[PDB]
Amino acid sequence: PLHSIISSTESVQGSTSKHEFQAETKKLLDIVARSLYSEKEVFIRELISNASDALEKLRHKLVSDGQALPEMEIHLQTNAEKGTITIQDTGIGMTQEELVSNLGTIARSGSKAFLDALQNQAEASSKIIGQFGVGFYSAFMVADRVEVYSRSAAPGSLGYQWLSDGSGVFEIAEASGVRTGTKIIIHLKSDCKEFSSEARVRDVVTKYSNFVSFPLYLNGRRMNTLQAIWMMDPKDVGEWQHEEFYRYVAQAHDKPRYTLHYKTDAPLNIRSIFYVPDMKPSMFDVSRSSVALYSRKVLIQTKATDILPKWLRFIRGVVDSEDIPLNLSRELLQESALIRKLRDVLQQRLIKFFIDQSKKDAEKYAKFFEDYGLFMREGIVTATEQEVKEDIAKLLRYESSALPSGQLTSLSEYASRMRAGTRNIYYLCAPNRHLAEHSPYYEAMKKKDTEVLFCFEQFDELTLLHLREFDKKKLISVETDIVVDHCLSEKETEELMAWMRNVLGSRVTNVKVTLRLDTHPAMVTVLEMGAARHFLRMQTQEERAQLLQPTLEINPRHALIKKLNQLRASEPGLAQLLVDQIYENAMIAAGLVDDPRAMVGRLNELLVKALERH
Amino acid sequence: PLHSIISSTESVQGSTSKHEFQAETKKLLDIVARSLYSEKEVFIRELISNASDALEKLRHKLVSDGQALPEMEIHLQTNAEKGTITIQDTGIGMTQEELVSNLGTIARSGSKAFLDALQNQAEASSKIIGQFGVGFYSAFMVADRVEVYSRSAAPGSLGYQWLSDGSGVFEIAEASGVRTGTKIIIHLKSDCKEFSSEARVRDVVTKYSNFVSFPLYLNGRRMNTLQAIWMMDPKDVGEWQHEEFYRYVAQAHDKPRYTLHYKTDAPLNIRSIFYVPDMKPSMFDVGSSVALYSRKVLIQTKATDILPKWLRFIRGVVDSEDIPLNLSRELLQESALIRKLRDVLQQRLIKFFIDQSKKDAEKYAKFFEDYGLFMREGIVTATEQEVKEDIAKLLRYESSALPSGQLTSLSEYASRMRAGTRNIYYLCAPNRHLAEHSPYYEAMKKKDTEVLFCFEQFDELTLLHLREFDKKKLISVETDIVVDHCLSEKETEELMAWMRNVLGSRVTNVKVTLRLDTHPAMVTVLEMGAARHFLRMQQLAKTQLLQPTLEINPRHALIKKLNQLRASEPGLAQLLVDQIYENAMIAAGLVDDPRAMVGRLNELLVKALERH
Ligand SMILES: Nc1ncnc2c1ncn2[C@@H]1O[C@H](COP(=O)(O)OP(=O)(O)NP(=O)(O)O)[C@@H](O)[C@H]1O
Ligand SMILES: Nc1ncnc2c1ncn2[C@@H]1O[C@H](COP(=O)(O)OP(=O)(O)NP(=O)(O)O)[C@@H](O)[C@H]1O
Ligand SMILES: [K+]
Ligand SMILES: [K+]
Ligand SMILES: [Mg+2]
Ligand SMILES: [Mg+2]
Known part of the structure; x- marks a missing residue:
């Protein structure tokens, strides 16, 4: 579909003209007054900024001359019945030349010229707001007629006047009795009479210009009373x-x-x-x-x-x-x-x-982390750069197995005194210190003389698995490390294995023997555990069973396993409930049970028929 | 003190002059090119909009005249060797006077003048995009000099060139070889040569001007090829x-x-x-x-x-x-x-x-199963009662007065209740079996009033937040348990006293209930749903105990065993009663992470059967 008339056949023959850019003032006024500001209350902010700029200019002029400093105030006034709002100033003011040069020309501001001709731009360039030159025309957005009185602070200037309706024409006259400075009077629209109410004006002023650098009044009472x-x-x-x-x-x-x-x-x-x-x-x-x-x-x-x-x-x-x-x-x-x-x-x-x-301070920081830890945990799992995650992770506090109970530790100091030549960090998730110490997983690894970080807070394993690394070291959970690691007669042991595979065939995939347990008759091991735990409770036995492959181990040294032998030899029906109860207890200890309401009835049946002879 | 200095001494006495507003073009151009747009790639959008407006004007003129319609399209070309981007169309074009009056004046658009003289203002007013008159000057934001070759479609027009560096002055000359339409040549800045690459231009075009009304080609291949x-x-x-x-x-x-x-x-x-x-x-x-x-x-x-x-x-x-x-x-x-x-x-x-x-109820059942959480979130986050009640019409529940698996809504439930009844009873459980075998439902089994079963999570919270539907009050079964108004008493009152002394700090009071048939114990709290929700939040996160009461039934076989167990095996009896209490709390749904109770349960299992 290559049909391109693009070429460079064009050539210039005629004499080149020369023109200047023009502007359409009426359309510019309409655009400023209709489709510039999304909210109609900003005109008060613009007028306050103009008054502040005038006061700043007067103050700088008086300071550069080393003269006395008169009062510098802004006076707002609202007349409800007349529907007018008045702002008064005591700044430099301006004569009719500046009036027709600044208020009569769009996008022209005398403040920028003042800043340029200062040669320092340090003491006063940090306190002048106006830079565009269109802020005064926001008054037409709420008014049908604007009336301005002003006279310059120069010794010999006279008052003036300035009227306009926002229709591309303004008239200038000469007025007497004008107080030195500048005063603006606004006559409000019919649909904008809400700005003659004191409460609305106070709300706007407090929202926008609380920290103006000069005293400000509204109907007589000062409103600043607070330094930035x-x-x-x-x-x-x-x-x-x-x-x-x-x-x-x-x-x-x-x-x-x-x-x-x-x-x-x-x-x-x-x-x-x-x-x-x-x-x-x-x-x-x-x-x-x-x-x-x-x-x-x-x-x-x-x-x-x-x-x-x-x-x-x-x-x-x-x-x-x-x-x-x-x-x-x-x-x-x-x-x-x-x-x-x-x-x-x-x-x-x-x-x-x-x-x-x-x-x-350690105790105060510990209290603060106890209060605001969840924000840091959330910040870990939403960042992308590993450097940011490592920076935030330094604020986390954990409890370790090599320290006494009830005191915290940090990852950076955990890596300080760990094993000389192992690049591994081990953490265990449990609700309490008691449950962490006597957890079957901790017992299965207690042979190794390594320090384990106990973490009790919620959404903590998730934080560790999203972190994945600290100082170029792997974060490995104990549950994964157990499977990564590589009495009762044997005949009865194997026969009970066969029976358990027979009874629990649908729910359990495999059964093994373990000599690493001493206080827990069973343990459930999955190839991965943290991600399985996280996924399980976002989303009855089976459709959860094939999504985990619950390998189950047996402890031949436990008394309950030993008694199961003769309780099956005597009554298989009781052993049927007993093995299910053992499996449920192991799954609960593994933390893979979401709602344990299901096992209550079977537990009640087992309890009521187990001890009926007593 | 009220410091006021406001007076009305101002008075005019002279003769008022008259002026009109001027403008400064250099400052306006700087403002447009520097502090108007957050992104620099929007100039392609403005140029494409201008080309589309020109094509619309030409098409309208030709159709109104009733003349034949030639081929019309816009071409956009990229050349990375000179770092230039070019756009060409086949619209009406511009004359010398039109060029000077339109391109050389800020805030003046000929598209508005064309629309005002249409006499219908509805046929084509829905297709003209430009309304402000400053969109052409965004090209100076990424360019140092621009060239415009234009020629009007009138029978006898002549070519022209419009040159400007964006410095506030432009020059116009007469050119030869310009074809009908317009053609804009852009020379990019040193730091803006990113736009002389096909991939970036294609990305911008697909982002902004994908659904234009006229066919456009980028380097020879059509881009839009899809109808809006x-x-x-x-x-x-x-x-x-x-x-x-x-x-x-x-x-x-x-x-x-x-x-x-x-x-x-x-x-x-x-x-x-x-x-x-x-x-x-x-x-x-x-978004x-x-x-x-x-x-x-x-x-x-x-x-x-x-x-x-x-x-x-x-x-x-x-x-x-x-x-x-x-x-x-x-x-x-x-x-x-x-x-x-x-x-x-x-x-x-x-x-x-x-x-x-x-x-179609069958498809809506699947849709509700897939997207139920959004409706509940909307109900929770809503404020106005009418908004809450409107969304609540999309919820589906199954009740006791229906066969298993069949769902209904609050509308039919309110329709089929008795005239005297004015409230709705709902019960939450993870499964229907647990719902109908719940200890609380067995107390409501006496009356024939219908009860709604809620299975999905956050259903309780949504029902609590809704709080009212169709001028009826939403109350739960567990709440109505307390609002509603074989182990003889002598050998039983002291047995509750025995539970009291054993469980002093865990149960406030223990009494006898007779509305239970299959459970050995049952636990009631004042506001069960709210307590459950706060407990779930606190165990989920530490944000900014309770008063449990335990009821037993003198008819359960397991409870009947405890009576003689005190006089024979008190050591077994204490932890058996602890098991009963924790089982009742688990069935109540108020249990936290249940890993704590495994060891004592194992001790029960070991000790209680060292006799067989
Ligand atoms: N109260 C005042 N006293 C003296 N001069 C004033 C006063 N208000 C406005 N001016 C002058 O009017 C000019 C134009 O005002 P304005 O429209 O606010 O432009 P700007 O404030 O400098 N730029 P910006 O307000 O940021 O859009 C200013 O540069 C001042 O010289
Ligand atoms: N390709 C073109 N063919 C013919 N006329 C054009 C073309 N591009 C621009 N113009 C003219 O240029 C004038 C002003 O350009 P422009 O700055 O885009 O204003 P606008 O598009 O009409 N309004 P807006 O785009 O919202 O700022 C338009 O009124 C057109 O008459
Ligand atoms: K101005
Ligand atoms: K224009
Ligand atoms: Mg201003
Ligand atoms: Mg445009």
Whole structure:
């Protein structure tokens, strides 16, 4: 189907012209006011940012001159009956030239020109928000008529006025009585009268601009009353401010148990603070990042980016940066490379912080791991890189067989003093220390003088089998190692073997003899056990039986096995129930029984007919 | 103190001037090329959309004129030697005035002017994609200089060239040899030569512009070759097209078991199709592949969840030409249209499932067996009572008043109850035999009221969360055991006292029940289902004991033996009573990991039979 008219036959003959790009202002205004912001409340944020920029410019101008500092405040006002919202400022202001150059031209901002002509861009380039030049036109999205009063702080400037309706035309006049600074008056739409209500405005202000750098008022009462401590050095801020900030951000009533104050500028500008709660995690904590992203003291509202890995969703705090790329809508540029490196840097720093906490305090870290271990266990099984899994795995605490009861140990220190020339790590799963010590599998391997890691928590064998390796060493379970490893008369032993294969033929594949058991009359061995256990309870005897191949062993030294001889010689019917009970007990001890409700009736029958002579 | 400085001293006294808004083109171009799109490959989508719009305009003009229709298609070519990407079409083309007025002006689109002068605005308004007027400038995001060779389709037009480096100035000249249509030459940047490779371009084309209305060829081979059946009439489309489309969109090799072809226009313009896979859900299956389209081009938000989370097991495509879009052609967040669409889709899917259940019970039984967990999860995660009750109509249970294996629903159960009765009784067990031989059911065996048997796990939790159906209260059998209002008493009261002193710290109280026939003991707690669920959570994970009561029956043979056992073998008697208590707790379903009781059971087995 190769039919390509693509060629280079084109050739230029006529004289080349020369033109300049134009623009359609009405369509640009319509696009800005209709299809730019997904929410209608952002105009308050934009106006507050503009007021903050004006105040910052005035403050810098006065500081560079060494003059006295007047008051620097933002004043919001709402009039319910008139349906208007008013924001006042005490910044630099602007004359009619700046009025018609900035408010009359799309995508032109004087703040960028101010920053460029500063020659330092250190003291003030970190405190100016405006960079695009279209933020003022969001007021037309909720208004039908905008009215602005302003006058410059220069000694001899006069007031002015600025009216528009968002219809591609604006009129400028000269006004008297204007207070120095800038004042914006907004007349609201019919369908946007909700913004004349004090509660809605307060909610928006607290959601977006709580940490503005200047005092802010709404109808007369100050709303800041709280310093952004993440911008200060740790040596200046006390613990009371830390706990109050944690109380504010976490919406809790307890104290933080861990506090990290992170400030870095080499790879990228990062100023963040992190908290770990004092209570235990709950159902909502497991349910679905609780960390707010900021940029020059303005919320970005990611709510989907998850700048922090999912398994770290239990920590709280704020993250602030100056170099994140944000689009024209003042939202994150989704899945940029900078975000993907910020996440890795932050998670590595958090891992390093958690590792160091163990050294300086052991009991507190043990309690924290007891509380928040499930998050680390989940983080093991969702990562992909082996290095990440090994980094997280250093936080796990286990109980070993070479140490006294009730004290923990780590994998790294487990590998410290293990056998000189064996690249193997052995772990056993049991609900208790008592069940781990007297487990048939542990007895079967107790001959070897190796240290076994007892793990009691749930979803732990799953974590080990997804880890598969630590410091280039294999993680081998005791159950697998037993099969990997390579009295009663023999005539009666073999005859009872034949009988057991006869009776338990359908459920059991093979029977063997074992001298490695001393306190358990039976044991069930499968070629693999951890994966079988995990698979069994996601999904009656048979359809589970051929999926396991339950090899069963017998202990000739046990008393019950010995008595089974003469209880079959005397009454085969009782032995019929006895062997089934032994098999059920062995399968229960192996941990392969999901719901043991089935065996209750047969156990009752065996008990009621076994001792009837007594 | 209330610090307020607001006054109204401002007054105007001069003569108002008049101006109009200007614009800065350099800053606008920088904003478009740098801080508008999250990805760099979207320029191919914009160019293909422009070519499709041009072809649509030419086709409409020719059909309205009534003239013959020539061949029309778009060609996209890749040349890695010069690091260039080229796109060519055979549309209407542009004149010199059209070139200057359209390509040289920001936020001006001729497609809107064409639509406004159509006099019907319905025939072709559903096929024109461009609406903003800034999509052509995304080519400067990956290029340093662009070339445009165009020639209008009018009988007497002349060729032209449109050159620009994206620096804010462009030059236009007259060219010779240009064929009818348009042709765009792109010279890629140093870091953007990734797009001079066939594989990446093919990936982008298949991702974004796979279902365009006109044939396109990449380096000579057709790419789309597949019809978008979600726009065609259901009667015009057969089974083979449905199977092929399903195997494409679902990326599977099986045959769908259910097919819904939804197409409505009254509340909103909707064209959609939904599929149910034949294979069972996997470990991995537990953005849902319901990708949203608009004007036959992918929107690709994949995060707003236009469909409820519990309905993530269905595959298909949803199209809507009235959806609002951002300047970057991404979904507007939380628009009322999105919520209306989600509600309508949920209701329609529920109605479709109900109708499918009515039409064929045998297939619906298998479907419910395969996909039961999703409905329970949706019931648990729902908030509104009507939403919970709508989903609950899809649940199936078997009851005691029916032969084994036959399932029914809550609707018929409510239909066939007595008029006086106002509540529903349900019992949970892993098997029917355990259900009908449960100690709790034997106490409810006296009355003839029907009871629903639940076998699958999380059924108890779902029934607890639902809490009400059709103005009736959902209560369990174990709850009603306590709400409802041969070992003579003398030789028995002291025997319960003996259990009390032996089991002081494990059972709060022990008494005698007479509603038991086959069990030696039975254990009751106040709120059995809730206690069971919390115990399962705690043993599953430490998140943020209880009060058990034990009843015996003086008629069981095994219990009758314990009376004389106290005076003969107390050492055997203690651990035998422990076995009885633990067996009762296991039968109650309140037992944790039962490995702890193996050793004492073995000691019972060894000791109790050292006499035969
Ligand atoms: N209250 C104010 N006082 C003084 N100048 C102001 C005030 N509000 C706006 N301006 C000026 O108006 C210009 C344009 O405002 P604006 O539309 O917000 O652009 P921007 O804020 O710099 N960029 P952005 O807000 O991020 O989209 C600014 O550069 C200021 O010079
Ligand atoms: N291949 C083409 N043939 C003819 N006209 C074209 C072609 N490509 C672009 N144009 C013209 O270019 C104008 C503006 O281009 P464009 O930037 O794509 O705006 P738009 O596609 O109409 N709206 P949008 O794509 O949503 O930004 C269109 O109105 C067309 O008239
Ligand atoms: K501006
Ligand atoms: K244009
Ligand atoms: Mg601004
Ligand atoms: Mg376009």
